[PDB]
Design an enzyme around this catalytic site. Sequence first.
Site, PDB file in Angstrom:
ATOM      1  N   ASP A   1       0.781  -1.707   0.226  1.00  0.00           N
ATOM      2  CA  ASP A   1       0.037   0.152  -0.056  1.00  0.00           C
ATOM      3  C   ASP A   1       0.803   1.238  -0.399  1.00  0.00           C
ATOM      4  O   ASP A   1       2.399   0.935  -0.370  1.00  0.00           O
ATOM      5  CB  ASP A   1      -0.966  -0.340   1.419  1.00  0.00           C
TER       6      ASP A   1
HETATM    7 NA    NA Z   1      -2.347   3.364   4.130  1.00  0.00          NA
END
Ligand code: NA
Length: 215
Positions: free
Chosen positions: A10
Amino acid sequence: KKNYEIVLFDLDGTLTDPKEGITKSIQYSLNSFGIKEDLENLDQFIGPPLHDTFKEYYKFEDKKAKEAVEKYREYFADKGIFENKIYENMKEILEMLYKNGKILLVATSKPTVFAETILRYFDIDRYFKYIAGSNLDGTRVNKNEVIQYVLDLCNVKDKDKVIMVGDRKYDIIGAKKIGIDSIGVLYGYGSFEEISESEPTYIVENVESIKDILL
Ligand code: NA
Ligand SMILES: [Cl-]
């Protein structure tokens, strides 16, 4: 111990910290309506939708709430996008993974254009094969969807050699829906309470500890 060949990351809270630009964008918006705030008091608005912040916290009407979002976006596109901080030691670990032949991918809910801009700004874009986020002025993409999209680009068969790295339950939930392992990090925006309750494959306190799991 397993040997992971494909590592997904991410962005916000995992590779880079968006605190400065997000808080300054909110501050700029609040200012447009004559509201003065210290950046420290806006940190709590990193995470929830802007609607919740302006509507639930500042109690702006639905119309004033959109004007506030527009002002935020104006500042973010102009300067907020360049106000990020890379986590200490992340560039080194990405270089180490890449030099070992691992395929590195980004799977994020952040708009792709922003993710690519930021990774380019820190000179780390070069280590990722594919970078997948959401569309600008589009619906926020769910994590399982972006994870699946990026694996499909790699034409993956052995999902056992795949792992997702992230700082929120959403990253771990996404990984579990796809059937891949996960590393929940504690140096980002997810608490130990949140991360531990999501039950990732591994939990790490700092960036350097990622090496111990992946290498
Ligand atoms: Na994040
Ligand atoms: Cl998901």
